[PDB]
Amino acid sequence: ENVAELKKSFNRHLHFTLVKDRNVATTRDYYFALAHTVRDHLVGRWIRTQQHYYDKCPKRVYYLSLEFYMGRTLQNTMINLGLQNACDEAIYQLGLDIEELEEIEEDAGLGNGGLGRLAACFLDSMATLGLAAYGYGIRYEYGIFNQKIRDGWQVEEADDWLRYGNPWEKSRPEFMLPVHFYGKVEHTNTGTKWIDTQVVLALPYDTPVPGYMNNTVNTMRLWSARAPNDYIQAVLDRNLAENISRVLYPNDNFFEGKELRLKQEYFVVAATLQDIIRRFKASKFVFDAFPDQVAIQLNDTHPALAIPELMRIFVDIEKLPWSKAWELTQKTFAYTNHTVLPEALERWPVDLVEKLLPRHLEIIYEINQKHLDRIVALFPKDVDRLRRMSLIEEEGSKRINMAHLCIVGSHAVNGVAKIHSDIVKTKVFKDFSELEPDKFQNKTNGITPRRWLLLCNPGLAELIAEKIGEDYVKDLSQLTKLHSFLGDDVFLRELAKVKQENKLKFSQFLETEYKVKINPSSMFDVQVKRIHEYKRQLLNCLHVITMYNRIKKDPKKLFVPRTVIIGGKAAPGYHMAKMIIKLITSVADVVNNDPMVGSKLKVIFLENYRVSLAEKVIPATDLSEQISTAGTEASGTGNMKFMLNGALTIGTMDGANVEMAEEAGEENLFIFGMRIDDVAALDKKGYEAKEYYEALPELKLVIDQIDNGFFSPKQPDLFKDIINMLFYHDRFKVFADYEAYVKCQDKVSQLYMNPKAWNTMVLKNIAASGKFSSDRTIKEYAQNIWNVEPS
Amino acid sequence: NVAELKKSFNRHLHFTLVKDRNVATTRDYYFALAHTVRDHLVGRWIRTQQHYYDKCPKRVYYLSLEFYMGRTLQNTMINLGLQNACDEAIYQLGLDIEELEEIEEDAGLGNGGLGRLAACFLDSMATLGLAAYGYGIRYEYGIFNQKIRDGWQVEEADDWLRYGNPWEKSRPEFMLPVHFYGKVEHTNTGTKWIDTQVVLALPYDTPVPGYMNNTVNTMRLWSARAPNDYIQAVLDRNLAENISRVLYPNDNFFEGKELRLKQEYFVVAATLQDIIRRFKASKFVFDAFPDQVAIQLNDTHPALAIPELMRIFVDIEKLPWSKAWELTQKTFAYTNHTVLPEALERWPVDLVEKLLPRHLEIIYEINQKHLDRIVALFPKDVDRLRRMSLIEEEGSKRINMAHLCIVGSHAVNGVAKIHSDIVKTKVFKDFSELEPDKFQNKTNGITPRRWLLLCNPGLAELIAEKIGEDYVKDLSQLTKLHSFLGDDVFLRELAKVKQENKLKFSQFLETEYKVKINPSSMFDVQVKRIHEYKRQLLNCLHVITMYNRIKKDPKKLFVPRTVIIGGKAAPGYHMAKMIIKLITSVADVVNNDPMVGSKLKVIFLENYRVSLAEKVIPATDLSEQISTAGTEASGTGNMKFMLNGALTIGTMDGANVEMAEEAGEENLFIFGMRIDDVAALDKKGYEAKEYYEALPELKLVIDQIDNGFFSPKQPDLFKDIINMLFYHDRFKVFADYEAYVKCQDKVSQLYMNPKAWNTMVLKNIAASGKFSSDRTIKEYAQNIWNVEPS
Numbered sequence A: 001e002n003v004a005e006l007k008k009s010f011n012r013h014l015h016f017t018l019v020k021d022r023n024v025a026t027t028r029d030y031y032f033a034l035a036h037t038v039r040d041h042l043v044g045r046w047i048r049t050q051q052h053y054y055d056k057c058p059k060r061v062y063y064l065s066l067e068f069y070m071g072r073t074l075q076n077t078m079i080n081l082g083l084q085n086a087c088d089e090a091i092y093q094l095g096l097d098i099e100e101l102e103e104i105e106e107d108a109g110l111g112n113g114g115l116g117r118l119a120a121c122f123l124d125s126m127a128t129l130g131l132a133a134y135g136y137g138i139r140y141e142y143g144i145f146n147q148k149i150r151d152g153w154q155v156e157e158a159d160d161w162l163r164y165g166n167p168w169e170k171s172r173p174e175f176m177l178p179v180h181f182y183g184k185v186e187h188t189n190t191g192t193k194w195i196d197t198q199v200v201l202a203l204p205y206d207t208p209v210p211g212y213m214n215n216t217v218n219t220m221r222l223w224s225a226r227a228p229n230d231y232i233q234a235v236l237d238r239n240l241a242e243n244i245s246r247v248l249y250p251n252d253n254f255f256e257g258k259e260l261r262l263k264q265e266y267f268v269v270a271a272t273l274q275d276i277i278r279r280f281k282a283s284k285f286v287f288d289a290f291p292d293q294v295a296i297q298l299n300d301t302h303p304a305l306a307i308p309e310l311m312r313i314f315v316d317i318e319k320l321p322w323s324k325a326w327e328l329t330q331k332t333f334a335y336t337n338h339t340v341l342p343e344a345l346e347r348w349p350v351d352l353v354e355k356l357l358p359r360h361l362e363i364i365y366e367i368n369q370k371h372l373d374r375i376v377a378l379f380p381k382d383v384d385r386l387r388r389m390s391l392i393e394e395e396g397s398k399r400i401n402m403a404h405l406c407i408v409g410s411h412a413v414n415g416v417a418k419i420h421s422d423i424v425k426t427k428v429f430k431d432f433s434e435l436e437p438d439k440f441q442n443k444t445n446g447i448t449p450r451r452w453l454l455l456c457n458p459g460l461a462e463l464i465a466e467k468i469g470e471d472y473v474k475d476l477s478q479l480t481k482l483h484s485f486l487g488d489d490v491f492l493r494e495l496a497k498v499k500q501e502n503k504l505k506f507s508q509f510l511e512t513e514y515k516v517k518i519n520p521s522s523m524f525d526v527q528v529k530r531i532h533e534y535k536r537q538l539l540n541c542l543h544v545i546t547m548y549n550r551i552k553k554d555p556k557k558l559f560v561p562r563t564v565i566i567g568g569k570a571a572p573g574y575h576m577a578k579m580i581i582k583l584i585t586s587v588a589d590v591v592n593n594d595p596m597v598g599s600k601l602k603v604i605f606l607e608n609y610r611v612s613l614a615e616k617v618i619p620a621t622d623l624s625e626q627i628s629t630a631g632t633e634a635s636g637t638g639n640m641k642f643m644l645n646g647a648l649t650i651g652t653m654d655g656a657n658v659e660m661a662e663e664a665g666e667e668n669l670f671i672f673g674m675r676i677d678d679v680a681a682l683d684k685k686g687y688e689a690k691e692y693y694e695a696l697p698e699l700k701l702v703i704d705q706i707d708n709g710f711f712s713p714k715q716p717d718l719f720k721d722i723i724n725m726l727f728y729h730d731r732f733k734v735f736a737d738y739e740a741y742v743k744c745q746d747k748v749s750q751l752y753m754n755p756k757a758w759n760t761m762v763l764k765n766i767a768a769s770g771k772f773s774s775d776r777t778i779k780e781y782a783q784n785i786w787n788v789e790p791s
Numbered sequence B: 001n002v003a004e005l006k007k008s009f010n011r012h013l014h015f016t017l018v019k020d021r022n023v024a025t026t027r028d029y030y031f032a033l034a035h036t037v038r039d040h041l042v043g044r045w046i047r048t049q050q051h052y053y054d055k056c057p058k059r060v061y062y063l064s065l066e067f068y069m070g071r072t073l074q075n076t077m078i079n080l081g082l083q084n085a086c087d088e089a090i091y092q093l094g095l096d097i098e099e100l101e102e103i104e105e106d107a108g109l110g111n112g113g114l115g116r117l118a119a120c121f122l123d124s125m126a127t128l129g130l131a132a133y134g135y136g137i138r139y140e141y142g143i144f145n146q147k148i149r150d151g152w153q154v155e156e157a158d159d160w161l162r163y164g165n166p167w168e169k170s171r172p173e174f175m176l177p178v179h180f181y182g183k184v185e186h187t188n189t190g191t192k193w194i195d196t197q198v199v200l201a202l203p204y205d206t207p208v209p210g211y212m213n214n215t216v217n218t219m220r221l222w223s224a225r226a227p228n229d230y231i232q233a234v235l236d237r238n239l240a241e242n243i244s245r246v247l248y249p250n251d252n253f254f255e256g257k258e259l260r261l262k263q264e265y266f267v268v269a270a271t272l273q274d275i276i277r278r279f280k281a282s283k284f285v286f287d288a289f290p291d292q293v294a295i296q297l298n299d300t301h302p303a304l305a306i307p308e309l310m311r312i313f314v315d316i317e318k319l320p321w322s323k324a325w326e327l328t329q330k331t332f333a334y335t336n337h338t339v340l341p342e343a344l345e346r347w348p349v350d351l352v353e354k355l356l357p358r359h360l361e362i363i364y365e366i367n368q369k370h371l372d373r374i375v376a377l378f379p380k381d382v383d384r385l386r387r388m389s390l391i392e393e394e395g396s397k398r399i400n401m402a403h404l405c406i407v408g409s410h411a412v413n414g415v416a417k418i419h420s421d422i423v424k425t426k427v428f429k430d431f432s433e434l435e436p437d438k439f440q441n442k443t444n445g446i447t448p449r450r451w452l453l454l455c456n457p458g459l460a461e462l463i464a465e466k467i468g469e470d471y472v473k474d475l476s477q478l479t480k481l482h483s484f485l486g487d488d489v490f491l492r493e494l495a496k497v498k499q500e501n502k503l504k505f506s507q508f509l510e511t512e513y514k515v516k517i518n519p520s521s522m523f524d525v526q527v528k529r530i531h532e533y534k535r536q537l538l539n540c541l542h543v544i545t546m547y548n549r550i551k552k553d554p555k556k557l558f559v560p561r562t563v564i565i566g567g568k569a570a571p572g573y574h575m576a577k578m579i580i581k582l583i584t585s586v587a588d589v590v591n592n593d594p595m596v597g598s599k600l601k602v603i604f605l606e607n608y609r610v611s612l613a614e615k616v617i618p619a620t621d622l623s624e625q626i627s628t629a630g631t632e633a634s635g636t637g638n639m640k641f642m643l644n645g646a647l648t649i650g651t652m653d654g655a656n657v658e659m660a661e662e663a664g665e666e667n668l669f670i671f672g673m674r675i676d677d678v679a680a681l682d683k684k685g686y687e688a689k690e691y692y693e694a695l696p697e698l699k700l701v702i703d704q705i706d707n708g709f710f711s712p713k714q715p716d717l718f719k720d721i722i723n724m725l726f727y728h729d730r731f732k733v734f735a736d737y738e739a740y741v742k743c744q745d746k747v748s749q750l751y752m753n754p755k756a757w758n759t760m761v762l763k764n765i766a767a768s769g770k771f772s773s774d775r776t777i778k779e780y781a782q783n784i785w786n787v788e789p790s
């Protein structure tokens, strides 16, 4: 606990655990010694917490997800355990730099973006709320790839995060389980049997999840695939079974029907459900009480197979009758929808499923038959309603609509922001909500204020605590008390000072990683998120070039200097996203080297955007770019992180941006562009991109520069694919929000010129960010879906 | 003290395994104890390695593709003087230390004798305080686990690292890149090897505790890792990692697979680079290298080390060829482990040219200078050149790796007198003639820690009772046991120890096998890899022979036996697999014939490996060492049996010859043709049928086999054996059959006389001192590596 004992443990681990002394120990050795020193502090409570759940047997919550975008664990653990100050002191006394030790840790990047990071924030919140919750996923050998930029383009490198060892995971060999694939179904007089299957073992690894200052330490269980049991070739072929948990599919909001992805989904699902049933049978609590002891949240449709798998276990194995089994199943599962973009919908062809999971295909067909029998009985004449509500789309080569399977097999279905949940309920699944009104809900996303405030921005956390105490950490709504300081000049300077320090520290980072020199006086304009056409960093890029031309046309004009930062990873096979990245690095090259613009404007493509880098750049941001086309971003969470950390937002009325406006007051955000209904109008009328190109002189110059090679001289036609998409296939109407966006941007610079007014708006944003704590989000899930209670 | 060991155990169970006493598994308890013991190694491991850096003694590097280590827990407790205290602490915690010990997986990174010799050498070098390092590959899968299904061998992956190996320590800061393929460019800045594929080598260090001396050496094993459609590209990283994936399961047999060639270059490249790097940091240019480094090539498997050292000195360090070649020879020594043709490494130049273009050039260069010398010495002997070349144009050109090891080394040694002589005067006559002093002998040895103190505590204690403990570090001290030759009480005590071992092993046999063991029977044992040259087929002929005898005359006085035969067959060795099936078939008939009953039991010991050897050897009365004269280079199993109180029935082959010299030929049951008789028969021509015709007991056995007596459901099952036996038996099974059976009868005779039997046993044990690997290592240190015990 105290400094002396922490130093003693550190030296002890460096010695016995790392087998080193101070003259031969590497930096990595020191990081590992500290990690083990911190990890030791988790054990007692990890054991008690899990023992407690067995004793008092509260209802358990299982968050089933193919992704857990955890980031680093060291600092997060020290903070939630109240050990950071002591460890900082101990490490300092040992003559070491704790910051350096922390940078040695690899991010556990087992996620693509929002969906995976939401799972991570939820685990922190559920532990902080004292819920008997478990995270269940896959332990990928390789997470989201490390991004490099070569000659302006994205290059992918394997994310070998486990190469040096992960001290934060605990193998649980005694819980290994067999998972089945392929084979065939036999309908015997003893029950249908699934036989001649190939077997792959599932080895679980537990990672502790410390609640914030509360003695609760929950568990995240990730499964790894292992082979069971010419000789050499046979041994090498063991790689095939093990490839199942080998790599995270690098796609964000995009469906790719590869068989290996289907294997991963069944793998997690099968291992997870069996483990859950086994723990249920040992609870010394037949399966009638199951739904009162178990809640399983389906994170998107990725784990949809859990439904037919639970049915398979209840029926084929436990011999329960179908009706009883189906009843228990619905009461067990709840489904969370995370998107409305067509390219992201999971639709598995029945042939692939038939080959890999013959018995699940049969169970799904059965589910679908009973389902449609009901509709036929309710709307005998609506024949097309049946076609629309079926789990099977015969529309060409038959496929399974996984979202529909999740809806019929779940008692609750929720979206992740009001605007989104509404669209899901009344438009996308109108036929279903009409039948079961009460089944559809909304649960607006949230972020954990531990990692995204206390951890990433200690200066702000301290300043806030200075003024209003520490209650806000566990009750973020407490930030409204900050309103008492609206006219407090001294406080406003203190707030600005914290942002300035964060910017200074991040600028140091930028100068050492990039050739560029940073004007620390500039406004940090930031857009960090996965590269997507719908998120439109392309629009941001149009505005950047626009500011460039303005400086060239009139260099002596008064101008608020900016440092424009854009970062994010493109899915490997997403060609347009890769072109967009190259467009940004090209533009940056011209801008950063034009002697006429100089320190007026700097552009940086932030490489390898991931959780640990987000913790650095967000606290250093002044302007947060949240410009997705109205109706495309289901919720967003980066928007919330920026709001909590003192940045103002420039964005569309989309996803949770709408709620950030409700809480803070629309005028305290720079809202702009078409709204959901305006986008529909343009669609109805038909979008003619050329018209804006024609009518907007600044837009036309930008476009022409791009298309003629102004930014790619050595290859004039390089950006032709973008031009063509922009003029003839822009599903996201980049040109249609261009004018309002730029006008809006000008207004931002205006406000920035007035520090007191700017920080006054910042204060209103921070003071109103309380609704976005994931602790609030989780309370709502616990109360209205899982029916469990905080402790 | 016990109290502190219990406290550490509980501490590790808690913080390290995250368990308490009601949820802890047996495996958790084994791991808690292992960490508790491992902690005791640290201080000395660090000091020992620091010491080598400070005083900078000359270092010895044992480069081997195999290290058949077995289990580490007990060996560590013993060499550290901690066994009694840990036993007591575990007992007090209400646990069974024996159960905990059986949890540990063997580190089976070897096939047999060659790999186990490397392990015994490490223990001895550490006990002698030498600055020695073992260098090899960290295979993900060692020698396969053997199962017997419907009488046949079935192989299962040996996933020894699945639950974690607490005995290894990753050394990430010493990772190195190894190169493959590419092409050679001869520039004006030196020849460059370019466009190569790169595979990383990650070293893992395992501590090697000397016996009671504060020395803890290192065994460094390399693991392959890939450097740095997207998904497919990530999955293909498996290809680079496949290099250190599986140990080739062949014992004394060459298989020219490209992956095996990759493994050999992999160990060699990573090892030589690491050695040079450690040399450059010694604050001791490369002139002193051979005075600071000795590298022992364990067989020709690491032969590439020679051209690789040349490549580094020349292509990289820019040293002139003559200087580089001089340093190289002073650095390497080569150990020959066999004369069997099928085991010689001959890589086709095409494969080497593709995978290692630069090494092929260096080898050609070495060969050119080599032959230039011979041409200058024997201008008219044109065929001498053909015989001494590193290249065999005899069809598709190939590289004779043994020849490369000889020209690139300053010393070449065999592993037993009879073997070393054959190597020097016959196989490499042309080379030894030129460099007489280059060829030596270093008779193999076994470590008396694992093979006596550990595996047979009863014997170790009995012996210490009579002569003190000096024998542990000076095994020659066992000769003091001669003072008890007439001591009746001692002879009963000796027999009692053997009886307890047999009792304990019989328990094992009954629970694993259906069979009921007559604990009164003589344990006749043949455990080693299944080979035609080791002839367990001959043993099988004798077994059937005894069977027929019991059937012909059931009421005759007969010494009862429990015949045990065990060993693994290389997966692709068809004959060996047939031989196994023949043995299990024979056993089926014998064990179930009501007429033989408890007179004779036959057991095929499944999954023979280091940890099982430690169980069955101490329980043996008769040790079968019957290879054809001139085929077993040395053997080491023979030595383990001698040390543990078993008598030997064998041919005058390998080290059996020296066991006879030490104990007195009459105290061993020697039989069969000798090296020269085998040659005579070869010259005259071996006509297997003649013995079949002339020996009525042999004929009946053979007919039974060939007609389906042992395979009724399939009469022609053993046809391949019959045909090999009559027309292609390179090992003359029939030609030693008569003497073997006569010899066997004499064994039973002696067994009937307990006092006479144990009197001979005592003479075997008292004379086993020469076979301690400690003696072997002293000889290598003095005459090859030029290093000194400390």
Ligand SMILES: O=C(N[C@@H](Cc1ccccc1)C(=O)N1CC(C(=O)O)C1)c1cc2cc(Cl)ccc2[nH]1
Binding pocket: A016, A017, A018, A019, A032, A163, A164, A165, A166, A167, A168, B038, B039, B041, B042, B045, B166, B167, B168, B169, B170, B205, B206, B207
């Ligand atoms: O592996 C040891 N310590 C561990 C310490 C560790 C544990 C978990 C994560 C990181 C580090 C170690 O160095 N690693 C496990 C990692 C891997 O599997 O790659 C790297 C170890 C200590 C030790 C001490 C002695 Cl005396 C002998 C063998 C030993 N191994």
Ligand SMILES: O=C(N[C@@H](Cc1ccccc1)C(=O)N1CC(C(=O)O)C1)c1cc2cc(Cl)ccc2[nH]1
Binding pocket: A039, A040, A042, A043, A046, A167, A168, A169, A170, A171, A206, A207, A208, B015, B016, B017, B018, B031, B162, B163, B164, B165, B166
């Ligand atoms: O892995 C831990 N201990 C290690 C301890 C260990 C190390 C080496 C051999 C056996 C056991 C562990 O259990 N294993 C490493 C093996 C593997 O590679 O599969 C199994 C560990 C302890 C711990 C304590 C907390 Cl609070 C959180 C995570 C933790 N992991």
Ligand SMILES: *Cc1c(COP(=O)(O)O)cnc(C)c1O
Binding pocket: A112, A113, A114, A117, A528, A529, A530, A609, A610, A611, A614, A635, A636, A637, A638, A639, A641
């Ligand atoms: C929060 C977060 C996201 C999601 O950001 P949006 O802007 O909401 O898409 C993506 N990646 C990382 C690393 C994050 O921390």
Ligand SMILES: *Cc1c(COP(=O)(O)O)cnc(C)c1O
Binding pocket: B111, B112, B113, B116, B527, B528, B529, B608, B609, B610, B611, B613, B634, B635, B636, B637, B638, B640
């Ligand atoms: C010693 C040993 C060997 C060598 O046996 P030989 O009979 O000398 O061939 C082979 N395997 C194991 C497991 C051993 O311990």
Ligand SMILES: CC(=O)N[C@@H]1O[C@H](CO)[C@@H](O)[C@H](O)[C@H]1O
Binding pocket: A113, A114, A115, A118, A252, A253, A254, A300, A338, A339, A344, A416, A445, A633, A634, A635, A636, A637, A655
């Ligand atoms: C398929 C997918 O990744 N959906 C994403 O989910 C997160 C978390 O709900 C939302 O914030 C975001 O708007 C949405 O694009």
Ligand SMILES: CC(=O)N[C@@H]1O[C@H](CO)[C@@H](O)[C@H](O)[C@H]1O
Binding pocket: B113, B114, B117, B251, B252, B253, B299, B337, B338, B343, B415, B444, B632, B633, B634, B635, B636, B654
């Ligand atoms: C190539 C090979 O494995 N050779 C083996 O080596 C061991 C160790 O020297 C000898 O005892 C044995 O007779 C021999 O068959």
Ligand SMILES: Cn1c(=O)c2c(ncn2C)n(C)c1=O
Binding pocket: A251, A252, A253, A254, A343, A532, A571, A572, A573, A574, A575
């Ligand atoms: C979002 N996204 C992708 O992620 C993607 C893609 N094509 C390939 N990938 C990987 N497309 C067209 C796409 O819109």
Ligand SMILES: Cn1c(=O)c2c(ncn2C)n(C)c1=O
Binding pocket: A153, A154, A575, A578, A579
């Ligand atoms: C690396 N890279 C790309 O990734 C790429 C490309 N053109 C299109 N793409 C997607 N070019 C020319 C290129 O060099």
Ligand SMILES: Cn1c(=O)c2c(ncn2C)n(C)c1=O
Binding pocket: B152, B153, B577
């Ligand atoms: C019938 N048979 C064989 O004939 C055989 C074998 N292994 C090797 N052979 C030759 N096995 C396992 C087997 O069942």
Ligand SMILES: Cn1c(=O)c2c(ncn2C)n(C)c1=O
Binding pocket: B250, B251, B252, B253, B342, B531, B570, B571, B572, B573, B574
């Ligand atoms: C020793 N041995 C083998 O190990 C072997 C073989 N054929 C295949 N293998 C694997 N032969 C003929 C052989 O003698």
